[model samples]
Target: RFLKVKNWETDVVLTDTLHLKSTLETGCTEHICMGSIMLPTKDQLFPLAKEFLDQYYSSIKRFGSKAHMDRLEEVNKEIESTSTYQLKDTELIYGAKHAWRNASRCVGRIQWSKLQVFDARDCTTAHGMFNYICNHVKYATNKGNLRSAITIFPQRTDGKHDFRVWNSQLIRYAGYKQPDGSTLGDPANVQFTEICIQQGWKAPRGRFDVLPLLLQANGNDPELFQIPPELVLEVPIRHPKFDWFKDLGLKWYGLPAVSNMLLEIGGLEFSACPFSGWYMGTEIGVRDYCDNSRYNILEEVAKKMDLDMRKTSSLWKDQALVEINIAVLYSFQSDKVTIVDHHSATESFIKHMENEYRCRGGCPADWVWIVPPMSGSITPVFHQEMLNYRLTPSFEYQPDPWNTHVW
Candidate 1:
């Protein structure tokens, strides 16, 4: 007979002959929730609500905003009564800034407090979602000048309605797999492109075709909207000295807007939060272009540079990698597009650590991401020790929209 008594930690009904099975067979674990309706428990909700309320009150004290203190009191009461709380606009803006500062994987935390947050939570229709995204892209793109911004949609409440952005980025090249095994464009986007095709969207005939924005609201079928070409600013990558490098036809978008991540503020999750930051040259030049799973352009670039690729000891890969990064920096600067070099970014990160230590007591960081992908030893972050810890008001990784939905 199943016991009516609920387990305090899990809220699951107990059985007399209860036996736990291996996760390998059941495909469910304590950490891994199987479905999209995985809501936070009352215990999880209480601490996060308390933490956010404390932070909000602290900001009010610092900024002399006594007018909003009453609203804070109201939220505190709600949290105490219902075990849940809602963030005001001012609180959300502050939380977004803190989220950026708390993002351990980001080396660009120096600009964390400058993030512009857009609240599109009232948008319930697919058309409304598309328009807001377009507006976000236009504002964040700002021609060649990129801005750090995040657009947050409605959160999943009551385990019913949900909103999500299917594309990894607001702007990304479509990947097409040929009849053979080779991919035509970005292999990372191949599965997403196939989804677009299945939804009756047309595929472009170019290697660097911009994919349409795929959006969904309230468990509806995803809608595709084309981004205006004028809004997208891309730089053609060419070497400062090597003229032949222009023939490679390599180029990348000026803005890097990540769309498929969850924004958690006080334990509530907004799954359709799309955030953007200006590119760091090494991110595109070293990892995106040279990584084996990615473009794998090192050998091609080495060949063009006429480096001795036959010997691993020759460090031809290293030589080509540096030049490629140089090209990215040069090209972005020539086009007047904002981009950060590895050296300068590393210095900024060091400064950010110092600033955060003074302001927030201790800074949490992930060393693997703090170091530059190409030159790990040369940067100051490479020599530093870092600690990674969970922080509230953070952007978190989530399953892809396709993975969670059968349709």
Candidate 2:
């Protein structure tokens, strides 16, 4: 399903209309005999390849150094001068070239067929070559001395973003308490109808509970109120998606495909975009919007207070209903990025398949116990399978009943 475009010019811009001409000219001028390079003995080439890898690794790290930071203005200008997508393509080419050079070291001594079999039937998504290569070399090290292997290469830089915590009532809903430890009445008692506008017009009626509004009313009925305050706002704190390789076992690994899934799902913005060709349906997208919840608890409490008559009746009665910004106590937990070590190649392979095909956007399938992969080819381990795995609300509404701000 992949194509090979050989003898392509690296520095030249290939316009669509002139690409064919450019390709032909470049191919004739720069084409080299692959057989000549491939004929060298593995032992002779391995050292050179290893040296190249070391140099490349050092260069990659240099990009993050203080010198690089100082030169960012100049480097950014240069990158902008070239096509953005072309820059990405060039980086990929460099990665692949270094990868193949390393692979050449083991090609004949280790059966190419066995490697393919090991990957297809026994490889787990979490410990695949792509994962290990990127984490150990591309990204900073994670584990103790031994770097954890990343399952997918070119780690995703995008996906859903929400800071809502799970299993907790918003501070406003629970009644705002003052920093001085005084208790405020139920936020629902606050009436915002009297808040004035510059034009002397009144604001529209507000909902008693903002959580339901945030969820677009998908949550429990506003009247029933049977669930715990926590349940009312609890969000599932799990990885965006999980995949299981049946041939490998029940254990699964979470992949970054949700980056693309988020694009299709719509709504909030994401920081990464997964590679195309493996998207599921919109159901996953819908869940992503609702799966994560975040809000300012104190802000909500202050809003509820602005609507309260008790605050207006006090000595300091003048106040406006502005969005309150405050630090919140977010509470949530989930299994989004934890990687499990497996003993079987088959199980690992299945996990990779699941990550590729099933685990994108958001899947409702919650796992029970982890399944073990096959025996042999079982050296698979999970590394940073989750990125930004958090479930904490940014702010909680805290109404200070006796404070002048309440009025």
Candidate 3:
């Protein structure tokens, strides 16, 4: 006799009496089943692979390269027969760009086609991973004018090994927890900093000290490597008209290189893929510097501007927010660095949506993320209803390195 078990959105049938008895003993519920193992069946994997293949083929046809069509056909056949298959360089590169294009959470998808791809799959050592990351940082930093680029490392294959970068970004400030129960620097990185200290790494004293890159290969312990301070470009935040704002002594890195996220393409996962794109003004100004969990400087800025902060009707927070965003844009422009203001970015996103609709017939976007944080009602994305769904060949957030022993 077969027994049916339902949990959340999944249903499974069990025929083995011993296994069913064990599951029942573990207090299985409609929402969750203890001692039950769930895996991605071929039904799910095949569809993801097919979607990636269709996009890859379309990209190839657009680039006037039918030379790899036969290879794609072979991969498609293998996908139906097996769980995984290898992708050529052309397919991987194009797929990476399309992943950015299909990333519903990203507001800067208008420049999706211009991503530079670096293939570092031959790297076998943690040191090699460090060097590749350094090169990626150097190239993407571009001496202040940031370039969008991604460096792909070897994927998990044959249970042999996998490479992983532990830092959220190639460059990030260390957060020190003080005795007074307050954070001295980036509060978000406090836990990561403590983990680094526990792993025999030295913690920095300053708030803006650049954290070293933590990398691991083939299930080994993660190793640390420092990025040269010269390669990391920083913009000193200051207002255009208010000279007093320069006294804030705040600065941020120019390039936003996300290193910890996993890059999944065609059912293959590149765990150590580091990608960088130029910053949008609000990402640094509104979210990073102004969010309560972050720097929480709105009150300070309002005080400096001599606004009545006691009354919410005074719009002191809104006033300070606009000034902060303006300062960010002005500073980047003065330094000749690449950055986009929210207005221009929203306009470009609208154009991207139209292009996707005409070319791909539909576009998926997250309404909350697509709209700028500072002025949602003013931006066009605020008014537009967007559909969000999971798509293959995309970047995804994965568990931290210290959280799992699999790394």
Candidate 4:
């Protein structure tokens, strides 16, 4: 059963090809730009959208920010689809998930047999993995009993510099308990613990506010300026130019990919979060063509028919373990900093990213490596080399995978 075709004409045009050429050229060259615009991870996309909005507010204003202002109205309408509160909620989820993804690279070190499995909804669930590692380290370092473990001069949220000390305690159970205090008999518990760290520390502050300032200063070309806390995906908003859309009075709405993010970010408490309704942990597949399996090398092995499945699992587990151990968690404490002072922090952070990771150009490699924000904007250093690599299209440069992929 098909509907009748409307009197719509389909025609091949030069502009179509031009658009395609432009998109591909821009996408591959601006991989950083694209990645910065939105994360490949579905859960993080909406928050990324908000950050994009904040950075490009001026551009939107210049184009006409009012509802009656031509393009400006259109942009505002689209943006308003997502509630400001929802946007704030997503910030923490994105931060936690991104951090987990970055740290899980070390899991490969654990033997597959030793590695436990729980049907986790998505990569963000890997926070359980971190909690597990912290517990193991505590137990081992304390000679059996779990004890508080302190990170040595760990990174802080101030954007300037600071340290952290985590006092871990062991528990007989894991997973969220029922309101009645009944156990939630679950295997996933083996990976996470009920003996969670007490909620005492304040949220980190530096990343969020600094980001918008940098965006305002750098005007959209973040590469030209040295930005701090370099893992943020910056995007300029296009709302200012589409103001005509608002006049239609069409209702608009936006649902974040994952609702659990609301809980992690402080918008909702863990107990009161609407987790069961949304299944917020599910790994909703992204609607894209690219392969995003984190372990490409392991992927190749898994595809081999004669390959030892156990061996492949072992390899992956080992990698995940190592990443968990060496992973660094950096945060800032200040809620807001003057643009001038934040600029200095940004400069310092840029130097750190460059010296440590060897970031090249505007490219910051991937979103996983970026820092998280407590409130406003999470700005990080841009990788100049990677940025250059992304900006140049494959057809134009034809770079070898060895240099280009790593770039």
Candidate 5:
């Protein structure tokens, strides 16, 4: 007797239930969906510390053991005396893995446990952050055979003394706002590119200029460092069949290194953890290549293929869309770069759900996100209604460093 809808496309009727009504109150009512947003957090760490420790020890089946109890007392006393706590090396690693596993909106959690956690909590300077970032990129790229990895920077002690990477991703195209109010590169990065320019970065104004890193250490003014050209693995977008596709002069970076997301484990908050993984074909093909707000090359590709521009009746957009995706996959494979198509990714996501449900009682997912940008119904996850919920020891979005900076 829960909210259900008539299914016009699938064989199954509408399906939704109150059994999944277990999310934290997020100011959402019947009129709206806040599923894509995260609540602004205000955590009191000590309580979370004990709660997560309980989970940790229980997970290892070492609850009530001498080592477990002693570890708890150590953290408790540390917090009791100093009002803050530090995670043990192993504890930090475990927490990092769980944070990724608990990411509700991510479709690639099947690789969550395999994430290489590069702990850089001892890092003390912006230069050190850049060094670690370069190393992370090199390892993640693996000469175009990308890998899933993260570099956890220092934690936030005082809200003022925070460490952060200002770049949304370690590798990203610079978006220069043109005189005619158009963007020269990725339109999504216009603001960050402006920030980089203001920080003395020379914008090459090229369509594929890799943006430099703006790293902030202990709330200090961020320092910019150009990414080493050798460390970046980029694939030139080409088609196996259509030789003209390469004439578009389009290319994309190999690593998708998401840098500003906050990582929480137990009671501690990691304000600067940069993580990277291989790209999925649809991400580049559909979103980056085809989106009107981004590169918006659908019309160009359509014209090149002699597609009918006149009407929706021709399904020309659909044909162009399919070809672009094919080109993306073809390009990466030819370059020996790691990439997955949407069909395979979603199929494995369903398998991941099976494993998660078998291990834990439920798997939280944003149905809207888990479904591919294109070919929604053809994927397995499209048929399954998912419950969107947040779990502890998770990766969370924080305000961009510049947003609250005094400078």
Candidate 6:
């Protein structure tokens, strides 16, 4: 029975020789699921560290070589004395890309090996984090041509000296609570917006106001820093054929830097590693702009288009959604910004899976996440069966800094 495996969320089942035993738990039981569970960021360092180092050496084709064996011994001795092994320069770089390569939630895994890893372990203050973040935004933005990058800060050694950015993304629009019942800007960040206000941030109260950065360093209280305006590249949405769409004044930041994710490597964890990549259109069009709890622009757009809101037969949502998505794609394209449409993105995912399966049998994947938001059966990934399991040297989600006692 152990030879057979079932995907937790899907009806698909498969047997991969004895490989099904590799994962400890399905993250579920026969009855209930704790799809998410938080473990201590720090792991018992010795054995897993050694295992990761060996895995590292093999990747570089130096598994049995002198340098590899010598490096292993060095790591062993350091862990014995200090109970943790600091990653050497190249060792850290490999793990960052390896983590990206192992990232199951991303459809852009095909570009994993090409990630630019920026190590900022020397930073001791939130000021320095702002500097690094500014530089990262500039470099990644490249004046609209985006590049994939991850900037890693100090690790959570001893479980106290942690560094983290409070914002979910490096760039986010403000979410202002109105005097009346309705909300303005991005409702998704309303809670975070309150934190910024409590920290003495003045609300500009504009619909698209950029939120300031809130960063925490070394278990100390967090600090706020407004990102330099010049470093933030934003694109204005305009439909290719629908001239009236531009009047809606929709916009989004050029970079998609996610700062809240924790980066784990070889059982070691870095609490303040921010990574970003180019966006897929649906992320902005379907989720950000049209989601009921977000901007919720569908009704407005439908009204403008004179589509019947009274009947589902009008498919007014469908019409408005298609128009909004086109506007996002066209805006990015005309602005010379980097973005991929869902159709092409899903197709590229399928292409990447060829190499992944051929080289390593079958890699882990979350079928739901891999599929784009807008279309299902029309996308290539929708037809594919997949698996998602926890793997090391990967980016993992942790508790929000304010939610936990880590501060």
What's each prediction's TM-score? 0.86, 0.16, 0.84, 0.18, 0.92, 0.92
Candidate 4 regions with alpha-carbon error over 4 angstroms: 1-176, 179-348, 356-364, 376-407
Indicate the worst ten consecutive residues by lDDT in candidate 4.
274-283
Write candidate 6's Cα lDDT for 1-407 as tens digits: 42333433344455433234233344666797554443421246767787788888988899999998898889888877877768998989999997887777889988888888899999999999999999899889998889999999999886577898999999999998889898999999999999999888999989999999998878788899999999989999988988888899999988999999888887788999999999999999999999999999999999999888998998899889999999999999999999999999888887776667657655667776788878777887887776666666888889888887453
Q: Candidate 5: global Cα-lDDT?
A: 0.85
Supply the TM-score for candidate 6: 0.92
* Error in Å for residue 107 of model 6: 0.6
| Cα TM-score of candidate 3 | 0.84
lDDT by residue for model 4 over 162-251, one digit each (tens)?
111111111111233456753332223312222121212121221112111100000111111111222221111112223432232211
Per-residue lDDT of candidate 2, residues 110-134 (tens digit): 1111211011112223223223323
Q: Rate the local accuracy (lDDT) of all candidates.
A: 0.80, 0.22, 0.78, 0.23, 0.85, 0.84
lDDT of 4 at 128: 34
Tens digits of lDDT, candidate 1, 168-218 = 998999888989788888888889889998887899747898999888998
lDDT, candidate 2, equals 0.22
Instruction: Provide the clash count, candidate 4.
Output: 58
Error of 1 at 14 (Å): 48
Q: Candidate 3: list runs displaced more than 4 Å.
A: 1-51, 62-69, 72-84, 158-160
* RMSD after CA superposition, every candidate: 10.6, 25.8, 10.1, 25.6, 3.4, 3.4
Report backbone clashes per prediction: 0, 35, 0, 58, 0, 0
Off by over 4 Å in 2: 1-88, 92-257, 260-272, 276-407
